[PDB]
């Protein structure tokens, strides 16, 4: 377990993966036989991300051209997934692939979603050279 | 006689069974539709090898 | 207080394979990602520059795209061109028609949800997912041509995300009922003459 | 020296447009056969020293 | 994109072709559908005996090897007719009639 | 005995459902089945404003890309007389014998990949690239989408766009004759072509066919003359023709007519008031103060734009020709802003009304020739 | 007849020869020519200043 | 002509490789795909019916003249083995046998039977 | 011939297929059968379809006058596609929940 | 309003179109009696018209009966500007059937087909009078402003 | 015909839609500072026909 070597203990880190994908899958493969289950976000389009990981926030939903306020006021995608999750799970793997009024997803909320692993293990997504490395994103995040 | 025979070799080996890349061989494809993993795969081997 | 809950996760997912017994089926599928091929369809506003992911400006054929112009042959369909009421009922046997590892995706934002025909027409069906499970979606209208790219390899992770058990959630059951009807026939209207 | 001839049928491939069959018969038929036998005819008294 | 060329895409299309559900269609059986296919391999798959490729390579001596090889060439019509009619529909019938 | 060829059509232009008898190898009787791409546009016409409606034509028209907007533009600038510049005029006659090479490609490329030509196909992209850059450059994303507002055009199109013609505008002229010279090879070619889904000019005109494959019978009836559309015909030009009308004449008088777009754009460029757009941008800077520049001459919008505006009772057809066929777009005359009723009539619905009789005794082979020369599209037929 | 016929089957034959071995002399320059087409996805095209992408 | 052991041993392998190759894509695969399946492709109409389509007419008599004039070759291949082993009596009579049969040819050629 | 309106989950199928395979595509077309969403976008447990059986004679045979013509195919498939909204609507039906994509045609959950 | 060219040539024959005035756009316009659309046909081309133009359906009000639209013209080599003719039909959603041109000339094969199924008018002198636009499934006429658009899920507010 | 410059344009496309309904473009994280091609640090791109010098 090579990823073992660096999620269970950091359960904060970011993905540097050359810019195709064709390499990374078997990574993910190995992940679902401790009690990580997937959760891919592409991060990309929510405001505040607190609100998205603790708090029932509205979505609003792509409107239909007419209909003034409406908006279904959905629920966050944490506890309730756990509430999904059997008492036999060790972390929720959660792949923030997007990390390359809204509020701009920057490496301040990156630290905000470094501690919901600590107070999901979740792993920013961004490429890099050819090598597939990994690398602590809370370093990098300021 | 090599002039005969390299035209021969022509459609002998299938060349060519569809004459352009948009234009089918000749009805949607060349006898081959249904067949679609290891069939089409022996087809295209016995093309080649003839 | 959750509207139309998730069902529970039914089992336990607790196993381990062997890489002996799982590397076959990881390489095997990074063969079937990587060496995956066209299927050829396109009717209208969301389709055109298709033709040019062939040349000199875009070219997907540099990784293998070989166009296949037959159902039960390729794997990858783009519905590309906004797609109306009819030739619908005809689209869904092409993938009914092809094996199973099709992984299809959508093309043309007024595929995904009818865009510039969504005000008031009988004719257009609003997006393609409401006809077909597709994966991932594609914007622009015309969509843009290098996305396409982006999101081919998207999916092609998708894939790789796949393992030795997963080869048996495409095994498929039969709810088929027992029920007749008692109505009246109607005869062939196409009529095939001049 | 097969790699050559591979090579000028993949080059052939993108310079004629092959024949449909109602043409290709033709050719077969009464183009190939009248020299295919016409060689031979000569071959005979060519190796009849 | 399959390595640094395509040295490895050509097995792997084949690998790919490999699983690819084989959905043998209603009309028409094993049958024919797989006795289909093995006449056609089988017909390019022997002519490889009389092949020589050096000196003192030859696999057989085999003195009507030339026409054992033109023997075996005019079999392969008669596998093409069988997959093209071990289907029902058109596109497959006139399909392989035509070749 | 009666096989359908396909509603996955492995042809050029997309869907089409072709059910034809079938003894063995020829064919008796086919039939076409229209109607599965319908854009419903006679519909959302009256339901809308004028610039909400804009984008629209180049939506169900992505192969002609521009030859929508001409109709498009005449009914709200040309109606009313919202004097539209000479300048601005020859600017969209620029477009206009652009787009003329617009479908001269986008047929021939697809016509060549049809009747045998193999290898050239991915040439005439290679060749077409160009055009891409320029719509894009000029209005805007690739299809060039809303380079016609009301009150002239959307924004006189930049520097870099009209004096840089030059290297396409002289590429392509040296590149004609390359196809010229690569069909009379290879009779092959020419066999297969040649004799095939001949038709006469007293048909011709009799079904209401027109384009260049009408043309292609010494009828000539090309309304590049015949309308003073935005005053464009200062300029000069060669009408292009044939004496057959079949499927090779199709070839031919497609092939010779976009040796006049390089040609007219030529005339243009170097007749155009302001000419090159960099020589008007630089020209306006000297003469800020007030010339002929920016007058009745020399500019793009006339009055303001916005979808505020109300019509009398004039119902107005303008039968303007494309290269692949003609175009119109009647409408009764309201005393709406939106008018009443909405009419379009494509070359497509009016091209396929002899397409059944065409193909009579022929085989499968002469079906695809003929359906490949025919220079059809769907997407205009259907509407 | 067949004097007609022996006069024009090599009249046949050599008009396809001067045809397709010009065509393979011609094409020759383009099998082997020096144009580089669309490089790696890694190479996207220029834009200039009047597009529309993400409002 | 001295051991076809090696034909034999290829024979038997190489009709092994098709099965072969058939049931390792068999044990390998999907119990799956209980779909219509009942129609094959390029007809995305779900078409069904129809027969008498053959145009056996033209191709028959291409077929005909082609059996018959095969048994040419399975003559010529001892006389063309034999030339120079024997004299030149056989050169004679092999070319009374090909003349025949190029007169036979030359028939078929004018009354039309190798048609479109 | 086998015209039937086969949109997603909803395939109320003109000709007589329950077998493994119909053998010829339609049986001869005399039974009008229909299966419910082969790609498992619904999990179904007996009793909640029961609903949708015994309905189904309230769309056959309690407002079918028309001839073998696909109106009547809208005329059912419209209803059929907002009997799976209401049951779901009310909670008693749920998504797939397996390793497909898992997309919502409906959006996803709310909190009522 | 009064008479045309065409009607100058033929009051020698006593047998007159229907007067009608001006278009809208600079022209004019005419009509022919429903019912006898066939000796108009006849006639014009016998005086040398051979192209149809505007094609196209009609209604007379929201809520109001049908109608339908022709205009036409020639071609020639030396042409200035031909004459623009115009006939406007009015006819009844009760019998609604108007001959066609179809039989005398053949540009209109397909071009009244979608009228077929378009408003709720057929016409005669038309083999394979059946829908093409509209699902052959579907069964009503739409396009009229008073039909009744399906109020369906599809159309009206679906929130 | 915004007032002051509101509506803008920009130009990238990595929509990795894995459901419709999550499209809420709010205020600022829309700029997000794109792809920035001559930003990147493995992107030369050359100037396409229309875009580079004559000949």
């Given at each position: 377990?090579?990823?073992?070597?660096?999620?269970?203990?950091?359960?904060?880190?970011?993905?540097?993966?050359?810019?195709?994908?064709?390499?990374?899958?078997?990574?993910?493969?190995?992940?679902?036989?401790?009690?990580?289950?997937?959760?891919?976000?592409?991060?990309?389009?929510?405001?505040?991300?607190?609100?998205?990981?603790?708090?029932?926030?509205?979505?609003?939903?792509?409107?239909?051209?007419?209909?003034?306020?409406?908006?279904?006021?959905?629920?966050?995608?944490?506890?309730?997934?756990?509430?999904?999750?059997?008492?036999?799970?060790?972390?929720?793997?959660?792949?923030?692939?997007?990390?390359?009024?809204?509020?701009?997803?920057?490496?301040?909320?990156?630290?905000?979603?470094?501690?919901?692993?600590?107070?999901?293990?979740?792993?920013?997504?961004?490429?890099?050279?050819?090598?597939?490395?990994?690398?602590?994103?809370?370093?990098?995040?300021? | 006689?090599?002039?005969?025979?390299?035209?021969?070799?022509?459609?002998?080996?299938?060349?060519?069974?569809?004459?352009?890349?948009?234009?089918?061989?000749?009805?949607?494809?060349?006898?081959?539709?249904?067949?679609?993993?290891?069939?089409?795969?022996?087809?295209?081997?016995?093309?080649?090898?003839? | 207080?959750?509207?139309?809950?998730?069902?529970?996760?039914?089992?336990?997912?607790?196993?381990?394979?062997?890489?002996?017994?799982?590397?076959?089926?990881?390489?095997?599928?990074?063969?079937?990602?990587?060496?995956?091929?066209?299927?050829?369809?396109?009717?209208?506003?969301?389709?055109?520059?298709?033709?040019?992911?062939?040349?000199?400006?875009?070219?997907?054929?540099?990784?293998?795209?070989?166009p296949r112009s037959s159902p039960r042959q390729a794997d990858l369909?783009?519905?590309?061109?906004?797609?109306?009421?009819?030739?619908?009922?005809?689209?869904?046997?092409?993938?009914?028609?092809?094996?199973?590892?099709?992984?299809?995706?959508?093309?043309?934002?007024?595929?995904?949800?009818?865009?510039?025909?969504?005000?008031?027409?009988?004719?257009?069906?609003?997006?393609?997912?409401?006809?077909?499970?597709?994966?991932?979606?594609?914007?622009?209208?015309?969509?843009?041509?290098?996305?396409?790219?982006?999101?081919?390899?998207?999916?092609?992770?998708?894939?790789?995300?796949?393992?030795?058990?997963?080869?048996?959630?495409?095994?498929?059951?039969?709810?088929?009922?027992?029920?007749?009807?008692?109505?009246?026939?109607?005869?062939?209207?196409?009529?095939?003459?001049? | 020296?097969?790699?050559?001839?591979?090579?000028?049928?993949?080059?052939?491939?993108?310079?004629?447009?092959?024949?449909?069959?109602?043409?290709?018969?033709?050719?077969?038929?009464?183009?190939?056969?009248?020299?295919?036998?016409?060689?031979?005819?000569?071959?005979?008294?060519?190796?009849?020293? | 994109?399959?390595?640094?060329?395509?040295?490895?895409?050509?097995?792997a299309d084949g690998t790919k072709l490999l699983f690819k559900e084989?959905?043998?269609?209603?009309?028409?059986?094993?049958?024919?559908?797989?006795?289909?296919?093995?006449?056609?391999?089988?017909?390019?798959?022997?002519?490889?005996?009389?092949?020589?490729?050096?000196?003192?390579?030859?696999?057989?001596?085999?003195?009507?090897?030339?026409?054992?090889?033109?023997?075996?060439?005019?079999?392969?019509?008669?596998?093409?007719?069988?997959?093209?009619?071990?289907?029902?529909?058109?596109?497959?019938?006139?399909?392989?009639?035509?070749? | 005995?009666?096989?359908?060829?396909?509603?996955?059509?492995?042809?050029?232009?997309?869907?089409?459902?072709?059910?034809?008898?079938?003894?063995?190898?020829?064919?008796?009787?086919?039939?076409?089945?229209?109607?599965?791409?319908?854009?419903?546009?006679?519909?959302?016409?009256?339901?809308?404003?004028?610039?909400?409606?804009?984008?629209?034509?180049?939506?169900?028209?992505?192969?002609?890309?521009?030859?929508?907007?001409?109709?498009?533009?005449?009914?709200?600038?040309?109606?009313?007389?919202?004097?539209?510049?000479?300048?601005?005029?020859?600017?969209?006659?620029?477009?206009?014998?652009?787009?003329?090479?617009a479908s001269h490609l986008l047929w021939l490329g697809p016509f060549?990949?049809?009747?045998?030509?193999?290898?050239?196909?991915?040439?005439?992209?290679?060749?077409?690239?160009?055009?891409?850059?320029?719509?894009?450059?000029?209005?805007?994303?690739?299809?060039?989408?809303?380079?016609?507002?009301?009150?002239?055009?959307?924004?006189?199109?930049?520097?870099?766009?009209?004096?840089?013609?030059?290297?396409?505008?002289?590429?392509?002229?040296?590149?004609?004759?390359?196809?010229?010279?690569?069909?009379?090879?290879?009779?092959?070619?020419?066999?297969?072509?040649?004799?095939?889904?001949?038709?006469?000019?007293?048909?011709?005109?009799?079904?209401?066919?027109?384009?260049?494959?009408?043309?292609?019978?010494?009828?000539?009836?090309?309304?590049?003359?015949?309308?003073?559309?935005?005053?464009?015909?200062?300029?000069?030009?060669?009408?292009?023709?044939?004496?057959?009308?079949?499927?090779?004449?199709?070839?031919?008088?497609?092939?010779?007519?976009?040796?006049?777009?390089?040609?007219?754009?030529?005339?243009?460029?170097?007749?155009?008031?302001?000419?090159?757009?960099?020589?008007?941008?630089?020209?306006?800077?000297?003469?800020?103060?007030?010339?002929?520049?920016?007058?009745?001459?020399?500019?793009?919008?006339?009055?303001?734009?916005?979808?505020?505006?109300?019509?009398?009772?004039?119902?107005?057809?303008?039968?303007?020709?494309?290269?692949?066929?003609?175009?119109?777009?009647?409408?009764?005359?309201?005393?709406?802003?939106?008018?009443?009723?909405?009419?379009?009539?494509?070359?497509?619905?009016?091209?396929?009304?002899?397409?059944?009789?065409?193909?009579?005794?022929?085989?499968?082979?002469?079906?695809?020739?003929?359906?490949?020369?025919?220079?059809?599209?769907?997407?205009?037929?259907?509407? | 007849?067949?004097?007609?016929?022996?006069?024009?089957?090599?009249?046949?034959?050599?008009?396809?020869?001067?045809?397709?071995?010009?065509?393979?002399?011609?094409?020759?320059?383009?099998?082997?020519?020096?144009?580089?087409?669309?490089?790696?996805?890694?190479?996207?095209?220029?834009?200039?200043?009047?597009?529309?992408?993400?409002? | 002509?001295?051991?076809?052991?090696?034909?034999?041993?290829?024979?038997?392998?190489?009709?092994?490789?098709?099965?072969?190759?058939?049931?390792?894509?068999?044990?390998?695969?999907?119990?799956?795909?209980?779909?219509?399946?009942?129609?094959?492709?390029?007809?995305?109409?779900?078409?069904?019916?129809?027969?008498?389509?053959?145009?056996?007419?033209?191709?028959?008599?291409?077929?005909?003249?082609?059996?018959?004039?095969?048994?040419?070759?399975?003559?010529?291949?001892?006389?063309?083995?034999?030339?120079?082993?024997?004299?030149?009596?056989?050169?004679?009579?092999?070319?009374?046998?090909?003349?025949?049969?190029?007169?036979?040819?030359?028939?078929?050629?004018?009354?039309?039977?190798?048609?479109? | 011939?086998?015209?039937?309106?086969?949109?997603?989950?909803?395939?109320?199928?003109?000709?007589?297929?329950?077998?493994?395979?119909?053998?010829?595509?339609?049986?001869?077309?005399?039974?009008?059968?229909?299966?419910?969403?082969?790609?498992?976008?619904?999990?179904?447990?007996?009793?909640?379809?029961?609903?949708?059986?015994?309905?189904?004679?309230?769309?056959?045979?309690?407002?079918?006058?028309?001839?073998?013509?696909?109106?009547?195919?809208?005329?059912?498939?419209?209803?059929?596609?907002?009997?799976?909204?209401?049951?779901?609507?009310?909670?008693?039906?749920?998504?797939?929940?397996?390793?497909?994509?898992?997309?919502?045609?409906?959006?996803?959950?709310?909190?009522? | 309003?009064?008479?045309?060219?065409?009607?100058?040539?033929?009051?020698?024959?006593?047998?007159?179109?229907?007067?009608?005035?001006?278009?809208?756009?600079?022209?004019?316009?005419?009509?022919?009696?429903?019912?006898?659309?066939?000796?108009?046909?006849?006639?014009?081309?016998?005086?040398?018209?051979?192209?149809?133009?505007?094609?196209?359906?009609?209604?007379?009000?929201?809520?109001?009966?049908?109608?339908?639209?022709?205009?036409?013209?020639?071609?020639?080599?030396?042409?200035?500007?031909?004459?623009?003719?115009?006939?406007?039909?009015?006819?009844?959603?009760?019998?609604?059937?108007?001959?066609?041109?179809?039989?005398?000339?053949?540009?209109?094969?397909?071009?009244?087909?979608?009228?077929?199924?378009?408003?709720?008018?057929?016409?005669?002198?038309?083999?394979?009078?059946?829908?093409?636009?509209?699902?052959?499934?579907?069964?009503?006429?739409?396009?009229?402003?008073?039909?009744?658009?399906?109020?369906?899920?599809?159309?009206?507010?679906?929130? | 015909?915004?007032?002051?410059?509101?509506?803008?344009?920009?130009?990238?496309?990595?929509?990795?839609?894995?459901?419709?309904?999550?499209?809420?473009?709010?205020?600022?994280?829309?700029?997000?500072?794109?792809?920035?091609?001559?930003?990147?640090?493995?992107?030369?791109?050359?100037?396409?026909?229309?875009?580079?010098?004559?000949?």
């Open positions: 377990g090579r990823w073992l070597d660096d999620v269970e203990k950091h359960k904060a880190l970011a993905i540097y993966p050359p810019h195709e994908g064709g390499y990374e899958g078997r990574y993910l493969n190995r992940l679902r036989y401790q009690g990580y289950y997937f959760l891919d976000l592409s991060a990309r389009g929510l405001g505040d991300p607190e609100s998205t990981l603790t708090k029932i926030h509205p979505v609003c939903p792509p409107s239909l051209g007419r209909q003034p306020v409406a908006r279904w006021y959905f629920p966050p995608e944490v506890d309730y997934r756990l509430s999904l999750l059997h008492p036999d799970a060790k972390g929720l793997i959660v792949w923030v692939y997007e990390a390359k009024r809204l509020q701009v997803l920057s490496k301040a909320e990156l630290q905000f979603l470094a501690m919901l692993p600590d107070l999901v293990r979740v792993i920013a997504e961004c490429g890099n050279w050819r090598k597939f490395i990994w690398k602590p994103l809370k370093q990098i995040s300021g | 006689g090599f002039l005969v025979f390299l035209i021969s070799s022509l459609a002998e080996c299938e060349r060519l069974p569809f004459d352009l890349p948009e234009a089918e061989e000749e009805l949607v494809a060349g006898y081959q539709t249904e067949y679609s993993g290891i069939k089409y795969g022996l087809f295209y081997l016995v093309s080649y090898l003839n | 207080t959750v509207m139309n809950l998730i069902e529970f996760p039914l089992l336990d997912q607790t196993s381990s394979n062997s890489v002996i017994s799982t590397t076959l089926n990881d390489l095997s599928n990074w063969s079937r990602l990587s060496s995956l091929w066209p299927l050829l369809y396109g009717t209208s506003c969301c389709f055109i520059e298709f033709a040019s992911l062939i040349g000199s400006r875009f070219d997907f054929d540099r990784y293998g795209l070989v369909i783009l519905t590309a061109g906004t797609v109306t009421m009819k030739m619908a009922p005809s689209l869904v046997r092409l993938y009914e028609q092809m094996p199973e590892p099709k992984y299809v995706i959508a093309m043309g934002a007024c595929t995904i949800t009818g865009g510039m025909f969504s005000t008031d027409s009988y004719s257009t069906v609003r997006g393609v997912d409401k006809l077909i499970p597709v994966d991932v979606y594609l914007p622009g209208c015309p969509p843009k041509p290098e996305a396409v790219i982006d999101a081919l390899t998207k999916l092609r992770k998708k894939i790789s995300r796949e393992i030795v058990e997963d080869r048996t959630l495409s095994q498929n059951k039969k709810r088929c009922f027992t029920t007749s009807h008692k109505l009246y026939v109607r005869r062939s209207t196409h009529t095939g003459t001049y | 020296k097969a790699y050559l001839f591979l090579f000028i049928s993949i080059t052939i491939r993108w310079t004629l447009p092959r024949m449909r069959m109602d043409q290709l018969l033709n050719l077969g038929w009464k183009f190939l056969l009248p020299i295919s036998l016409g060689n031979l005819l000569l071959t005979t008294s060519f190796q009849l020293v | 994109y399959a390595g640094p060329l395509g040295l490895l895409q050509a097995i084989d959905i043998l269609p209603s009309r028409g059986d094993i049958s024919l559908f797989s006795i289909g296919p093995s006449i056609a391999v089988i017909s390019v798959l022997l002519s490889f005996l009389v092949i020589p490729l050096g000196y003192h390579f030859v696999l057989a001596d085999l003195s009507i090897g030339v026409f054992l090889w033109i023997a075996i060439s005019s079999i392969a019509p008669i596998g093409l007719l069988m997959a093209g009619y071990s289907s029902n529909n058109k596109y497959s019938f006139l399909g392989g009639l035509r070749a | 005995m009666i096989v359908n060829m396909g509603p996955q059509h492995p042809s050029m232009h997309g869907v089409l459902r072709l059910i034809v008898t079938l003894d063995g190898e020829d064919v008796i009787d086919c039939e076409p089945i229209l109607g599965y791409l319908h854009r419903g546009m006679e519909k959302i016409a009256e339901n809308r404003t004028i610039i909400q409606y804009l984008p629209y034509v180049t939506r169900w028209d992505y192969l002609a890309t521009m030859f929508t907007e001409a109709i498009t533009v005449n009914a709200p600038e040309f109606l009313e007389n919202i004097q539209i510049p000479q300048r601005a005029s020859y600017i969209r006659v620029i477009m206009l014998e652009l787009s003329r090479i060549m990949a049809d009747l045998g030509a193999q290898t050239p196909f991915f040439y005439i992209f290679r060749e077409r690239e160009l055009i891409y850059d320029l719509f894009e450059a000029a209005t805007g994303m690739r299809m060039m989408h809303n380079y016609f507002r009301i009150g002239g055009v959307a924004a006189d199109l930049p520097y870099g766009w009209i004096d840089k013609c030059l290297d396409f505008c002289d590429y392509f002229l040296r590149g004609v004759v390359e196809y010229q010279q690569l069909i009379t090879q290879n009779p092959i070619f020419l066999e297969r072509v040649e004799g095939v889904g001949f038709i006469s000019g007293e048909e011709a005109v009799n079904w209401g066919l027109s384009g260049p494959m009408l043309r292609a019978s010494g009828i000539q009836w090309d309304l590049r003359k015949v309308d003073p559309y935005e005053s464009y015909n200062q300029f000069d030009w060669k009408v292009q023709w044939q004496k057959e009308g079949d499927s090779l004449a199709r070839y031919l008088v497609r092939v010779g007519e976009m040796s006049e777009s390089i040609k007219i754009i030529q005339q243009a460029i170097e007749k155009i008031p302001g000419g090159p757009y960099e020589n008007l941008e630089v020209r306006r800077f000297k003469k800020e103060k007030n010339s002929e520049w920016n007058d009745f001459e020399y500019k793009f919008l006339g009055k303001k734009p916005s979808p505020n505006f109300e019509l009398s009772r004039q119902e107005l057809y303008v039968r303007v020709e494309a290269p692949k066929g003609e175009l119109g777009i009647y409408l009764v005359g309201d005393d709406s802003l939106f008018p009443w009723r909405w009419k379009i009539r494509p070359p497509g619905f009016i091209n396929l009304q002899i397409l059944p009789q065409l193909v009579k005794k022929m085989k499968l082979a002469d079906i695809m020739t003929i359906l490949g020369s025919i220079d059809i599209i769907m997407g205009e037929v259907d509407r | 007849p067949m004097v007609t016929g022996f006069m024009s089957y090599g009249q046949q034959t050599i008009r396809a020869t001067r045809y397709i071995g010009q065509s393979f002399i011609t094409t020759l320059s383009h099998t082997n020519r020096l144009p580089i087409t669309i490089h790696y996805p890694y190479e996207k095209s220029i834009t200039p200043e009047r597009f529309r992408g993400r409002i | 002509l001295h051991e076809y052991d090696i034909f034999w041993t290829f024979l038997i392998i190489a009709s092994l490789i098709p099965i072969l190759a058939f049931s390792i894509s068999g044990l390998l695969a999907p119990v799956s795909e209980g779909p219509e399946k009942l129609s094959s492709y390029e007809s995305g109409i779900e078409p069904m019916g129809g027969a008498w389509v053959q145009f056996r007419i033209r191709y028959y008599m291409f077929a005909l003249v082609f059996v018959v004039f095969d048994v040419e070759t399975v003559f010529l291949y001892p006389w063309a083995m034999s030339f120079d082993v024997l004299g030149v009596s056989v050169f004679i009579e092999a070319l009374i046998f090909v003349l025949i049969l190029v007169v036979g040819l030359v028939y078929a050629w004018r009354k039309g039977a190798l048609e479109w | 011939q086998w015209l039937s309106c086969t949109t997603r989950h909803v395939r109320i199928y003109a000709a007589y297929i329950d077998p493994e395979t119909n053998a010829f595509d339609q049986t001869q077309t005399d039974k009008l059968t229909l299966m419910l969403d082969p790609t498992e976008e619904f999990v179904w447990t007996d009793e909640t379809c029961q609903m949708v059986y015994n309905e189904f004679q309230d769309l056959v045979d309690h407002y079918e006058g028309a001839p073998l013509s696909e109106y009547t195919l809208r005329l059912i498939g419209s209803d059929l596609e907002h009997y799976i909204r209401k049951l779901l609507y009310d909670g008693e039906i749920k998504y797939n929940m397996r390793s497909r994509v898992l997309n919502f045609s409906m959006g996803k959950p709310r909190v009522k | 309003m009064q008479q045309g060219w065409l009607s100058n040539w033929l009051v020698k024959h006593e047998v007159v179109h229907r007067s009608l005035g001006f278009d809208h756009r600079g022209i004019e316009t005419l009509q022919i009696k429903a019912g006898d659309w066939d000796s108009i046909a006849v006639i014009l081309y016998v005086y040398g018209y051979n192209y149809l133009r505007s094609q196209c359906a009609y209604d007379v009000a929201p809520g109001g009966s049908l109608a339908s639209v022709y205009h036409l013209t020639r071609i020639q080599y030396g042409i200035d500007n031909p004459e623009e003719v115009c006939i406007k039909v009015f006819a009844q959603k009760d019998n609604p059937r108007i001959p066609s041109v179809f039989w005398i000339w053949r540009s209109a094969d397909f071009q009244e087909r979608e009228s077929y199924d378009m408003v709720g008018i057929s016409y005669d002198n038309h083999p394979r009078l059946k829908r093409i636009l509209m699902p052959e499934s579907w069964i009503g006429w739409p396009l009229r402003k008073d039909y009744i658009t399906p109020n369906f899920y599809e159309i009206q507010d679906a929130h | 015909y915004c007032p002051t410059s509101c509506l803008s344009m920009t130009e990238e496309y990595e929509l990795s839609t894995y459901d419709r309904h999550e499209l809420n473009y709010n205020q600022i994280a829309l700029s997000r500072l794109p792809i920035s091609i001559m930003g990147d640090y493995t992107i030369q791109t050359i100037r396409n026909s229309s875009e580079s010098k004559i000949n």
